[PDB]
Coordinates of C-alpha atoms (C1' of nucleotides) and ligand atoms in Angstrom, one line a residue:
Chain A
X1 CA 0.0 0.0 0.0
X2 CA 1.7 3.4 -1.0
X3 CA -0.5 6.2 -0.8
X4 CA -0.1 8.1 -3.7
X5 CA -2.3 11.0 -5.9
X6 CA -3.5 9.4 -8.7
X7 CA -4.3 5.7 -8.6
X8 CA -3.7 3.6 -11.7
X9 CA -4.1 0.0 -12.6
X10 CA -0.6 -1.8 -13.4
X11 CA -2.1 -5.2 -15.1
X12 CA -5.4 -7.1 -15.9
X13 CA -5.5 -8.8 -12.6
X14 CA -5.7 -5.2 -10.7
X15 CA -9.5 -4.3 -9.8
X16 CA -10.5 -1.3 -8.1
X17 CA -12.5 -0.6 -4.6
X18 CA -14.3 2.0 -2.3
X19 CA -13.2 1.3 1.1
X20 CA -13.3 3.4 4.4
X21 CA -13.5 6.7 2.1
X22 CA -10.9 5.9 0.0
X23 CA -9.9 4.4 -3.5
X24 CA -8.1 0.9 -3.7
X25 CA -6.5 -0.7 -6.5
X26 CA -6.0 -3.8 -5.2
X27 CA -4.3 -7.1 -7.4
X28 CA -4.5 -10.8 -5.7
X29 CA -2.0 -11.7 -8.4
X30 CA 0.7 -9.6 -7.4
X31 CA 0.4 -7.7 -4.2
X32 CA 3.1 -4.9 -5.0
X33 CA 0.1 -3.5 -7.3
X34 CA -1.8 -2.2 -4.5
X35 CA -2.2 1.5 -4.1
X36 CA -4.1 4.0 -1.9
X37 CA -5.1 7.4 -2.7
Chain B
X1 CA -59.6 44.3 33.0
X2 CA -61.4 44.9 35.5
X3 CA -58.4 43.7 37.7
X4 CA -56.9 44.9 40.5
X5 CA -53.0 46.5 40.0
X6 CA -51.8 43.9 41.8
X7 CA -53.3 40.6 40.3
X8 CA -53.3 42.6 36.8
X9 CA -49.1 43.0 37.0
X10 CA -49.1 39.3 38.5
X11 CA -51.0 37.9 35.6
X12 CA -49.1 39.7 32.8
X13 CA -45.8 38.8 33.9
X14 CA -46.0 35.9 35.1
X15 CA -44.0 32.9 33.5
X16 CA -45.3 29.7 31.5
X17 CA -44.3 25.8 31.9
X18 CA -44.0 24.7 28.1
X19 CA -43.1 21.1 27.1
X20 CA -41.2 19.9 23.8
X21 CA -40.7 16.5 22.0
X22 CA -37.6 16.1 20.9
X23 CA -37.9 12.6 19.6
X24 CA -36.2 12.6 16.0
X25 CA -35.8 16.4 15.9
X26 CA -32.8 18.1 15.1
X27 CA -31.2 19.2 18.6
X28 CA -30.8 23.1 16.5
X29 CA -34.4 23.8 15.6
X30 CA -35.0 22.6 19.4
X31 CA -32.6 25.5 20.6
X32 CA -34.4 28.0 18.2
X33 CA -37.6 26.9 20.1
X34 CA -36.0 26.4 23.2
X35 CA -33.9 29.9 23.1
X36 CA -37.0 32.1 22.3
X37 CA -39.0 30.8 25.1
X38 CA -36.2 31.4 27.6
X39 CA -35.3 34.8 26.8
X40 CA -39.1 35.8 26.7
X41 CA -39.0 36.5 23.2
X42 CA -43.0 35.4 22.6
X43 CA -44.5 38.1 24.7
X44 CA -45.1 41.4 23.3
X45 CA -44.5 42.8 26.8
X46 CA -41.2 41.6 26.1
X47 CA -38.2 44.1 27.5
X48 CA -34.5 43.2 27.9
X49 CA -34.8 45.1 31.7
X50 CA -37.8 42.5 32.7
X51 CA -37.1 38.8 33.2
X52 CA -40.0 38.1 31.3
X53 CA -38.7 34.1 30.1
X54 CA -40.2 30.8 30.7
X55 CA -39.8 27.6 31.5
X56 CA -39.1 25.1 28.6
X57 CA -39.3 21.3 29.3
X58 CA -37.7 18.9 26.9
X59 CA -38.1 15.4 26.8
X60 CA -36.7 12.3 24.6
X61 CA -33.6 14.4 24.3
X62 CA -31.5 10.7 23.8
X63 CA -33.6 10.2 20.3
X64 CA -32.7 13.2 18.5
X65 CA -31.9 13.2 15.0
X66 CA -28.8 14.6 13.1
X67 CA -29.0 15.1 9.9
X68 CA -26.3 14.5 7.6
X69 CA -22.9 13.0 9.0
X70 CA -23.0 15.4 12.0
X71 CA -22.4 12.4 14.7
X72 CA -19.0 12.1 13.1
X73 CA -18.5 14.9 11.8
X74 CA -19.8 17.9 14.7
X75 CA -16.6 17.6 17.4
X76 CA -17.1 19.2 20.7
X77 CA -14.0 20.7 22.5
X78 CA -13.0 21.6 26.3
X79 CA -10.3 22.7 28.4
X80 CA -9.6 21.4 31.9
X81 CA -7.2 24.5 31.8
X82 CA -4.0 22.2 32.4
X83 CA -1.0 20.8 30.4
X84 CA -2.5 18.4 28.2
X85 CA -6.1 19.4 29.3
X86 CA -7.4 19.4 25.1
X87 CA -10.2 17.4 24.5
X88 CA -12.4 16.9 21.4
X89 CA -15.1 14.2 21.4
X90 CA -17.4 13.9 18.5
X91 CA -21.1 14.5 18.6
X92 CA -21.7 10.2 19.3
X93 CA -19.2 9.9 21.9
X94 CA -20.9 13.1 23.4
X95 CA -24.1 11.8 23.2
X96 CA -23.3 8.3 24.8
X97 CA -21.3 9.9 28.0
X98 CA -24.1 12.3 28.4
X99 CA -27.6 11.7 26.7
X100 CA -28.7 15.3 27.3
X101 CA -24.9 17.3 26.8
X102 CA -26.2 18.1 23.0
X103 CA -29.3 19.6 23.6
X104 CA -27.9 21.7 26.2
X105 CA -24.8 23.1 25.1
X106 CA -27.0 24.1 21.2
X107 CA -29.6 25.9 23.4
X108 CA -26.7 27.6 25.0
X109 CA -25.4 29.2 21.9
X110 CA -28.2 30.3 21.2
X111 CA -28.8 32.4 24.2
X112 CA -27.2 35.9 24.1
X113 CA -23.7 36.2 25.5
X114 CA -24.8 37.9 29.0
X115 CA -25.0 37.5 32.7
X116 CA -28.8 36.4 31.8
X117 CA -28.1 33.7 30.1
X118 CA -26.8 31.7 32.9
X119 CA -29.9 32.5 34.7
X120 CA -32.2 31.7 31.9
X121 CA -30.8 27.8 31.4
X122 CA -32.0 27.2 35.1
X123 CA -35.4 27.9 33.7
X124 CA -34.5 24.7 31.3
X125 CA -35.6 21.3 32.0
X126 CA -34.3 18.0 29.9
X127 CA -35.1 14.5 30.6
X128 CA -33.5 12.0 28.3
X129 CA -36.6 10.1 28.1
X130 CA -40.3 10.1 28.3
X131 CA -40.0 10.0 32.3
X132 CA -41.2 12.9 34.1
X133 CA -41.0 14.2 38.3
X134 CA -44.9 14.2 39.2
X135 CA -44.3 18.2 39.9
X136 CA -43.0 19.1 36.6
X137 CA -46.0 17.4 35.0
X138 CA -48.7 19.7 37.3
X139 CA -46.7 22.8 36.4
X140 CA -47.0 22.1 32.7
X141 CA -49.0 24.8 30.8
X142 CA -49.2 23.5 27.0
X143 CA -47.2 21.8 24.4
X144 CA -45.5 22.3 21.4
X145 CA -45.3 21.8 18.2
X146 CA -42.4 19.9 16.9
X147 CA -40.0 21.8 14.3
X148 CA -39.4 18.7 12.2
X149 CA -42.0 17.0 10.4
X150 CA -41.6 12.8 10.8
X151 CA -41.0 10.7 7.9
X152 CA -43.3 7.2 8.3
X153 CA -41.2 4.3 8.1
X154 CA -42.4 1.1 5.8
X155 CA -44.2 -0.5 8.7
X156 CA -46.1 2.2 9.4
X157 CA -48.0 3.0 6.3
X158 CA -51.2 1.6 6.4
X159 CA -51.9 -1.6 4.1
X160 CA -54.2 0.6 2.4
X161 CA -52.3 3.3 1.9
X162 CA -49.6 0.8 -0.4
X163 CA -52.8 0.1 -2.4
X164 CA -53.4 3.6 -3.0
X165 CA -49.6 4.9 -4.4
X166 CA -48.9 3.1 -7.4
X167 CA -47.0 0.0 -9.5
X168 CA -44.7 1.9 -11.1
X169 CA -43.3 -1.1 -13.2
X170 CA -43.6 -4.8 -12.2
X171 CA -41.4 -7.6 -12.1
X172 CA -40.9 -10.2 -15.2
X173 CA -42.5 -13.9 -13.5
X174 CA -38.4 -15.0 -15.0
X175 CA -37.4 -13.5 -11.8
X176 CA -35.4 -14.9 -9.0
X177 CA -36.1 -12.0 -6.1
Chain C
X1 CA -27.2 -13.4 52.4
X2 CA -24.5 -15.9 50.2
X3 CA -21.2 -14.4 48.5
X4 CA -22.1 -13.8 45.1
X5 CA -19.4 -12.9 42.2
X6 CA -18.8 -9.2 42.3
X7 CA -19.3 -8.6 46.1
X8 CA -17.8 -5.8 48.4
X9 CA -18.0 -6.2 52.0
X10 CA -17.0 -3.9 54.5
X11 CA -13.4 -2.9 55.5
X12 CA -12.1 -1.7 59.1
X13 CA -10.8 1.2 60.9
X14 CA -7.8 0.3 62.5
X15 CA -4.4 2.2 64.7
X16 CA -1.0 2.1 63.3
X17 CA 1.5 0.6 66.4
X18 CA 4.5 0.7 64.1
X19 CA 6.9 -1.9 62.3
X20 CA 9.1 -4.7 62.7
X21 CA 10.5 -8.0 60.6
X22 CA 9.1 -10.6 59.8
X23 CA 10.3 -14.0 57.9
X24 CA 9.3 -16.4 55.1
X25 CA 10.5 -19.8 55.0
X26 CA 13.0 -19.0 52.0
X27 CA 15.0 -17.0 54.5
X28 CA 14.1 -13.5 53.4
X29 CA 13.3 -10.8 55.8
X30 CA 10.0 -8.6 55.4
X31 CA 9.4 -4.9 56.8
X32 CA 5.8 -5.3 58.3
X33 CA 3.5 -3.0 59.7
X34 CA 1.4 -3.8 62.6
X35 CA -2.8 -2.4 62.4
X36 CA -4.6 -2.8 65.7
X37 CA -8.6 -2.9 65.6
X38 CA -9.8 -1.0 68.0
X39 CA -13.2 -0.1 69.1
X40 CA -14.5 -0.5 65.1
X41 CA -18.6 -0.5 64.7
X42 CA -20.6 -0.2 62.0
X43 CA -22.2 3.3 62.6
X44 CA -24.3 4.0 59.7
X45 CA -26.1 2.5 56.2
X46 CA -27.6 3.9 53.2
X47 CA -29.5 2.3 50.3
X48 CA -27.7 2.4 46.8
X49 CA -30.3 5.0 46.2
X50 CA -29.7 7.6 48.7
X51 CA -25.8 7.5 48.1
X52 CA -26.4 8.2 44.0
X53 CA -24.2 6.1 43.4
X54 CA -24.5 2.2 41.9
X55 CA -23.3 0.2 45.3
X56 CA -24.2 1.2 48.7
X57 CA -22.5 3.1 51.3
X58 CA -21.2 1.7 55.4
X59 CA -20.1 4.3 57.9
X60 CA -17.6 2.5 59.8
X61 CA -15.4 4.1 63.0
X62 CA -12.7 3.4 65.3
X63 CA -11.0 4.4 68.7
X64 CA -13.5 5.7 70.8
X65 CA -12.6 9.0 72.5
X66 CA -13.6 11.0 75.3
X67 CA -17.1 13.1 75.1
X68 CA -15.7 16.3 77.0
X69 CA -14.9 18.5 74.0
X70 CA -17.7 17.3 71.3
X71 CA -19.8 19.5 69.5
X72 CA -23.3 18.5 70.4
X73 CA -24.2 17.1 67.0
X74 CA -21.6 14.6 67.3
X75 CA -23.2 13.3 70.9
X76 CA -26.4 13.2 69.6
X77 CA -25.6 10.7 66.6
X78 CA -24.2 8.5 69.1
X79 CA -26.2 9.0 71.9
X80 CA -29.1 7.6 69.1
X81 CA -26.7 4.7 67.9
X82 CA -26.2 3.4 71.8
X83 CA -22.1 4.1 71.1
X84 CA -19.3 6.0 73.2
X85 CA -18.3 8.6 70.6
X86 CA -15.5 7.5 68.1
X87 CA -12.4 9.2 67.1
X88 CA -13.4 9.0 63.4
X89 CA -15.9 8.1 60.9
X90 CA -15.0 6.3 57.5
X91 CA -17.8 5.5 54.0
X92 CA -17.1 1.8 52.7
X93 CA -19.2 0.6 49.5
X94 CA -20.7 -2.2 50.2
X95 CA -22.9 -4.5 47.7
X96 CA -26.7 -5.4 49.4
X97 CA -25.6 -8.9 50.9
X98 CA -22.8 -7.5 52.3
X99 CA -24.7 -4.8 54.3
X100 CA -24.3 -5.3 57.7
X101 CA -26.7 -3.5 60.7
X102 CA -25.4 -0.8 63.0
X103 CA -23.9 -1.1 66.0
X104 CA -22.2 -4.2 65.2
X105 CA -18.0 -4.4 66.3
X106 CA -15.8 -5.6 63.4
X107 CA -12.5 -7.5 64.8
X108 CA -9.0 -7.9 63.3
X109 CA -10.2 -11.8 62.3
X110 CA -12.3 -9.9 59.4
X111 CA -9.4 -10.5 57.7
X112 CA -7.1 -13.6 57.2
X113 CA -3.7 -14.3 56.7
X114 CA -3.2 -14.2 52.4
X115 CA -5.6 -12.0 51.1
X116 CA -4.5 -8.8 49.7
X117 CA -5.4 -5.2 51.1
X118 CA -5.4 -1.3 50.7
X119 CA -4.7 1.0 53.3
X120 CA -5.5 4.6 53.2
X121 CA -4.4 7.2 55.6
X122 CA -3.0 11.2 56.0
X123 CA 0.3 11.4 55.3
X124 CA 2.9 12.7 57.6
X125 CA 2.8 16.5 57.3
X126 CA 6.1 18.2 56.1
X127 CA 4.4 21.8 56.7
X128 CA 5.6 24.4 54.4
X129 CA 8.5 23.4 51.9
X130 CA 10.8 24.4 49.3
X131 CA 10.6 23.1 45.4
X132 CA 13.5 20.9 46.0
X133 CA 11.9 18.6 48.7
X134 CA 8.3 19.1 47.6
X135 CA 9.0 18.2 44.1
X136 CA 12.8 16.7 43.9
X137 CA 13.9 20.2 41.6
X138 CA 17.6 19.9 41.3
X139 CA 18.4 23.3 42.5
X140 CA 21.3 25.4 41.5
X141 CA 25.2 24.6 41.5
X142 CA 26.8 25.8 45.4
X143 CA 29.6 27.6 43.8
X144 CA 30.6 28.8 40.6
X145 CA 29.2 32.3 40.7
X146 CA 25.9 31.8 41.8
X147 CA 24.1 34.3 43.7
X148 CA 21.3 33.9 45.9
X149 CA 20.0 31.1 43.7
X150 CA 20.4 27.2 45.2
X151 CA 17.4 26.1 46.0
X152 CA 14.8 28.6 43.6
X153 CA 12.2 27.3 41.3
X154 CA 14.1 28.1 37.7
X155 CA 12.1 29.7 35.2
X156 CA 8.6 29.3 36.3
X157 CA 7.2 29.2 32.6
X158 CA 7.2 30.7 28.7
X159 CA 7.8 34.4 27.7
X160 CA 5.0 33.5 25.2
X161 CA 1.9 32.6 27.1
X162 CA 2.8 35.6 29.1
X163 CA 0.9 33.6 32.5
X164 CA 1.6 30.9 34.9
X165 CA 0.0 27.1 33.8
X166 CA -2.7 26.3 36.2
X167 CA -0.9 23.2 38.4
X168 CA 2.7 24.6 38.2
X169 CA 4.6 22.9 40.9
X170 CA 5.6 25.7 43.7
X171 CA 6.8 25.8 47.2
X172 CA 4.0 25.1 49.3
X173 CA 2.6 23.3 51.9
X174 CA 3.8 19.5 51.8
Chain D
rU1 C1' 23.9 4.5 57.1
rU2 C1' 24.7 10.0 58.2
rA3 C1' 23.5 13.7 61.6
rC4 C1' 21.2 16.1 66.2
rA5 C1' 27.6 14.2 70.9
rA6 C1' 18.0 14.3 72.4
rA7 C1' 12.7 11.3 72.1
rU8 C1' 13.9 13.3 65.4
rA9 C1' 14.9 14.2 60.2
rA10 C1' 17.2 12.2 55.8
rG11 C1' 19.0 8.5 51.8
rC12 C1' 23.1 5.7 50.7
rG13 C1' 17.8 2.1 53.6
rC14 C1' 12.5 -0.2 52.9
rU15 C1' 7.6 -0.9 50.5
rC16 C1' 3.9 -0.3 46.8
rU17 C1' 2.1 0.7 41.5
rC18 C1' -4.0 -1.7 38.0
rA19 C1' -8.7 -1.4 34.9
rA20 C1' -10.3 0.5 28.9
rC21 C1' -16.8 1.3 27.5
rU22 C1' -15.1 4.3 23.4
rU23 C1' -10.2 3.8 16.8
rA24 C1' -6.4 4.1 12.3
rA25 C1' -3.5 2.2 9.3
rU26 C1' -4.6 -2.7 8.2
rU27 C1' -7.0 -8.0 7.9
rU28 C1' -11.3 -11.2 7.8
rA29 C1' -16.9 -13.0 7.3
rU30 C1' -21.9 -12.2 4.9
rG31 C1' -23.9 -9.6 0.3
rA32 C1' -26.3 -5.8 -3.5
rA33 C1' -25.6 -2.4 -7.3
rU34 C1' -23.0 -5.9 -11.4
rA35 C1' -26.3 -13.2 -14.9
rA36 C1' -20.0 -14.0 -10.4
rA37 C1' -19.6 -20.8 -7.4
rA38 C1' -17.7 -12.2 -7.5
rU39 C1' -16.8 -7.6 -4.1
rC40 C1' -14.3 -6.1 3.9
rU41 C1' -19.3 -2.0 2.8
rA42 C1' -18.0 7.0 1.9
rA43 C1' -24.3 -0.1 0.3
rA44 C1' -27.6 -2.0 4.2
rU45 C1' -24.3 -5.5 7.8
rA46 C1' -20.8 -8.9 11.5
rA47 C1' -16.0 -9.1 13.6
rA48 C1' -10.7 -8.5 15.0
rA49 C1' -7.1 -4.7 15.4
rU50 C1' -1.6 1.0 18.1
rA51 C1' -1.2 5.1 21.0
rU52 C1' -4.9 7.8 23.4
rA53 C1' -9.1 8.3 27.3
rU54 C1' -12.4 8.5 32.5
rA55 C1' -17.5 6.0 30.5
rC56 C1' -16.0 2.5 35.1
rG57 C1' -13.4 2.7 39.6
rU58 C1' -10.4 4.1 44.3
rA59 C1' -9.6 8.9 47.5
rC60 C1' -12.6 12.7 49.7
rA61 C1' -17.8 12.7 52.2
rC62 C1' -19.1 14.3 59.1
rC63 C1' -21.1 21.1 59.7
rC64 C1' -18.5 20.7 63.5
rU65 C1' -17.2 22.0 71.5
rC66 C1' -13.4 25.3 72.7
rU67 C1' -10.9 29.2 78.9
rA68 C1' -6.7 26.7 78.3
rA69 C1' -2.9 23.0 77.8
rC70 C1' -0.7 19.4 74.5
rC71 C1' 0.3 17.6 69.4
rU72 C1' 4.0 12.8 64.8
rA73 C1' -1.1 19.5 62.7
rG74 C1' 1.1 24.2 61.7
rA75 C1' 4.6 30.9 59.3
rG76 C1' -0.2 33.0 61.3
rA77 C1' -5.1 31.2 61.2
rA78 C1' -6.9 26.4 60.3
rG79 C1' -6.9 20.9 62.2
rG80 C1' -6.3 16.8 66.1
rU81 C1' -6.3 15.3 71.4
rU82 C1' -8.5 16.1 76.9
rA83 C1' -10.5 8.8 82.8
Chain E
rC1 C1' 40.9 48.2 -6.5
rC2 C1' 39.4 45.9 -1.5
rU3 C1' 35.7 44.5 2.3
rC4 C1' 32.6 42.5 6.8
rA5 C1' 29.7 41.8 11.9
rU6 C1' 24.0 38.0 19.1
rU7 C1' 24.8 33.0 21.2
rG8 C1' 26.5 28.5 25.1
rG9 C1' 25.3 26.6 29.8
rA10 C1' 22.2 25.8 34.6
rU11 C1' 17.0 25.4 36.5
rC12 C1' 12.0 24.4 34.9
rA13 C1' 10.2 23.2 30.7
rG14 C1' 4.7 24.2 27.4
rG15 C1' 3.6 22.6 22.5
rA16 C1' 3.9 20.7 16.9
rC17 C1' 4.5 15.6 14.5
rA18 C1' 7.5 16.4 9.3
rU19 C1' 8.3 9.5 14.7
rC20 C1' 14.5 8.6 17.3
rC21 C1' 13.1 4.3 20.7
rC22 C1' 8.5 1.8 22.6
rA23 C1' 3.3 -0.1 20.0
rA24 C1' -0.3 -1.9 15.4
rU25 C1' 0.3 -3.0 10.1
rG26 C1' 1.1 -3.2 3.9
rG27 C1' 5.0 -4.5 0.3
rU28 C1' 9.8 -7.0 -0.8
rG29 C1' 14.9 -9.0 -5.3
rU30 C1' 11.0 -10.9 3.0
rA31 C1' 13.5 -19.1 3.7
rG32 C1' 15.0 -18.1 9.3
rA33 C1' 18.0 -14.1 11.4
rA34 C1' 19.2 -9.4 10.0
rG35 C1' 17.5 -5.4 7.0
rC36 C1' 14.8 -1.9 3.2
rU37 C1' 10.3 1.0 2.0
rA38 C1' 5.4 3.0 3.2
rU39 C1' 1.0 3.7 6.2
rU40 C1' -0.9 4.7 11.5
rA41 C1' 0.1 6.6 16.1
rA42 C1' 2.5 12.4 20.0
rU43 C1' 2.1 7.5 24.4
rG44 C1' 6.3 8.0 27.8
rG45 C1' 11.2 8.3 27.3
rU46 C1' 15.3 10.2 24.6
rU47 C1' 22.9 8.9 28.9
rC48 C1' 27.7 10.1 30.8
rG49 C1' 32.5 12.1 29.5
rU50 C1' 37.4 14.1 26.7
rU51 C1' 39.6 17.7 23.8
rU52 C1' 37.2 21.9 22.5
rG53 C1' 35.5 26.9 20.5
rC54 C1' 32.7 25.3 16.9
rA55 C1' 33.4 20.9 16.3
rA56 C1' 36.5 16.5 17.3
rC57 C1' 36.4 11.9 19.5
rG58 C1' 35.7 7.9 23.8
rA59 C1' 32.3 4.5 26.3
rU60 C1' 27.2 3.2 26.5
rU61 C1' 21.8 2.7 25.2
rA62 C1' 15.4 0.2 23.3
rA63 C1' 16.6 5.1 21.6
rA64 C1' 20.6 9.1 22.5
rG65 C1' 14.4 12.4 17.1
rU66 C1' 13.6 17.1 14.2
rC67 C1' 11.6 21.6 15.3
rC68 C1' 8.4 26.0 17.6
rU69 C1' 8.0 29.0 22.2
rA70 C1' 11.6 37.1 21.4
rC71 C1' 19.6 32.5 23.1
rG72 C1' 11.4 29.7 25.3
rU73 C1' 13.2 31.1 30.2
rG74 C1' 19.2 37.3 32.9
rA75 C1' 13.0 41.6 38.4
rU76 C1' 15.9 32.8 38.6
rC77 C1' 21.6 32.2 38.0
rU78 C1' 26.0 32.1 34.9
rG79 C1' 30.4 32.0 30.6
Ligands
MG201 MG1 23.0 20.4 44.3
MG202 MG1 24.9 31.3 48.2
MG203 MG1 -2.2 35.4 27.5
MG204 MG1 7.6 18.9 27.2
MG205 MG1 2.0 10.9 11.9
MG206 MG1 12.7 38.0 32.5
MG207 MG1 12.4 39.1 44.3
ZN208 ZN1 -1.6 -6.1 -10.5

RNA sequence: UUACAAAUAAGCGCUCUCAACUUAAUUUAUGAAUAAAAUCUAAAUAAAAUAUAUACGUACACCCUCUAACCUAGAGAAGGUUA
RNA sequence: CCUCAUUGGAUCAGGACAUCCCAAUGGUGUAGAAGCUAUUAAUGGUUCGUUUGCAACGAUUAAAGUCCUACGUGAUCUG
């Protein structure tokens, strides 16, 4: 998780959530892909 | 007319026991109630000199309504007047230490910013729920309209009253639901 | 009534004699303190109600004094109670089966050897004091070049806030 | 132990120190928008999870005679004691 | 053609968090152990000396944080 300004998605695997008032792009696949805004 | 001086000045001046609802109301329309009784801002022998208010009697204080994200969001702050005395609780952490802080401390904004007001909130009464002293109840004058008009949940519109409102669309039968 | 979980009986008022040591069977010594019982009755019981708070309240109180310099008030409580007057009263908070009627002398055997207890008393009086022994303040160096200043509160605060903290430690009364 | 070549005071001596209702990052479970045998949810929900803190405790609680004397109480006053 | 002039310490510290240690976590080119990076958190703590006039070292520590308060603080003291 780094939080960073603009969130975008690195591969196919990466989906995108809504959580606790933020935006997640979290991957299963590969777990360096996650990002918080 | 036709009174003496001294029950004439009596009746005119004398102060009236008033009772609010506060069950889902908004604790600031309450206060805006709630203030104008106090300072004796619904006579028109109203004067600034005369100590004119009235009592104001709340009740179901712990079901007030907020709209919005105001339990979060609404913080309210105090100093013990130590090192390290800050404190900020929100408006839900308020209202479980102290069911009736809310109501209390909106009214007292409201209130102008004088030696009166002090005495004005002894003139205030707030019970958390329903529950009443026996003497309060005897001293009680008239009610009050509440501010805040009640939505009807599901469960309490009538069975004909769903009858009445519309089928907007209905549901294909090749439905799970 | 039966001990139920979460029960608080009542505690005693007792005289201090003083110390001496004591020994385990591994050897080691103990410092001990030695509380005598004396003259302890229940004196007086409210109802959770009347207290305000959740558990009940016992007035319990020890070492019965002499009557000849009493304010009448005092002489009349125990002149109701059947008691010679006692040296001083104490509030315990008692649960509802614990309550136990006035008049009734509490002994040293209330308690038994193993249990744990808390003991509560004014502390010796040190009358008025510096900052140094009130509040362990290093002071000021003896020599040097100092003048005047060894044992003197430093600076007592901020140029900013342009006041004294409410609770600032100062000489006082110890 | 060091003093007063006093009945005391000190430390270099001795004893005692605890509970968390309430959250943030984060992690789970159930499940819609969204055909999933998806999805932790600024959807309705169920949980776990720093530091904080006072909800919850302990302490205090008495309306109090005073010539005077005495006091491990004290600058004074206050306070304690008086077959 | 040349140039150049408030701040240490002692005492007592209040506060910020842009966290030095303590605590809870995500990621790893994380096997374990050591580490690296980021989020969260201001909780209590954050040593003693030598040469020094600014640094330069010694021995320790879980750590020896970075800053604001008119060198924070001279009707408290001191170079
Ligand atoms: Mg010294
Ligand atoms: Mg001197
Ligand atoms: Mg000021
Ligand atoms: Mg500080
Ligand atoms: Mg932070
Ligand atoms: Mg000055
Ligand atoms: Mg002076
Ligand atoms: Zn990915």
């Amino acid at each position: 998780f780094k939080t960073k300004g603009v969130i975008k998605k690195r591969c196919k695997d990466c989906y995108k959530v809504k959580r606790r008032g933020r935006w997640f792009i979290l991957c299963k696949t590969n777990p360096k892909h996650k990002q918080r805004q | 007319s036709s009174f003496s001086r001294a029950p004439q000045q009596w009746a005119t001046f004398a102060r009236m026991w008033y009772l609010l609802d506060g069950k889902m109301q908004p604790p600031g329309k309450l206060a805006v109630i709630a203030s104008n009784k106090l300072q004796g801002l619904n006579k028109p022998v109203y004067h600034q000199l005369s100590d004119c208010g009235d009592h104001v009697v709340i009740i179901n204080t712990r079901h007030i309504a907020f709209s919005g994200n105001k339990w979060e969001q609404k913080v309210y702050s105090s100093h013990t007047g130590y090192p390290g005395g800050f404190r900020q609780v929100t408006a839900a952490q308020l209202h479980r230490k102290d069911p009736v802080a809310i109501v209390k401390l909106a009214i007292y904004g409201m209130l102008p910013k004088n030696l009166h007001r002090r005495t004005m909130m002894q003139r205030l009464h707030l019970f958390p729920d329903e529950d009443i002293p026996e003497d309060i109840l005897k001293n009680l004058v008239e009610e009050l309209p509440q501010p805040r008009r009640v939505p009807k949940r599901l469960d309490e519109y009538t069975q004909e009253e769903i009858e009445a409102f519309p089928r907007v669309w209905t549901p294909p039968d090749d439905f799970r639901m | 009534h039966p001990w139920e979980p979460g029960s608080f009986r009542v505690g005693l008022i007792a005289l201090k004699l003083g110390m001496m040591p004591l020994w385990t069977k591994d050897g080691q010594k103990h410092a001990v303190t030695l509380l005598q019982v004396q003259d302890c009755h229940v004196l007086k019981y409210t109802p959770k109600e009347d207290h305000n708070g959740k558990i009940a309240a016992l007035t319990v109180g020890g070492k019965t004094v002499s009557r000849f310099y009493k304010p009448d008030s005092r002489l009349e409580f125990y002149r109701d109670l059947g008691l010679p007057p006692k040296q001083i009263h104490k509030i315990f908070h008692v649960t509802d089966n614990a309550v136990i009627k006035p008049g009734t002398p509490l002994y040293a055997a209330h308690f038994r050897p193993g249990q744990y207890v808390d003991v509560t008393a004014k502390t010796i009086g040190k009358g008025f004091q510096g900052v140094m022994k009130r509040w362990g303040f290093k002071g000021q160096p003896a020599s040097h070049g100092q003048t005047k200043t060894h044992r003197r509160p430093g600076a007592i605060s901020t140029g900013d806030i342009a006041r004294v903290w409410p609770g600032t430690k100062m000489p006082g009364r110890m």
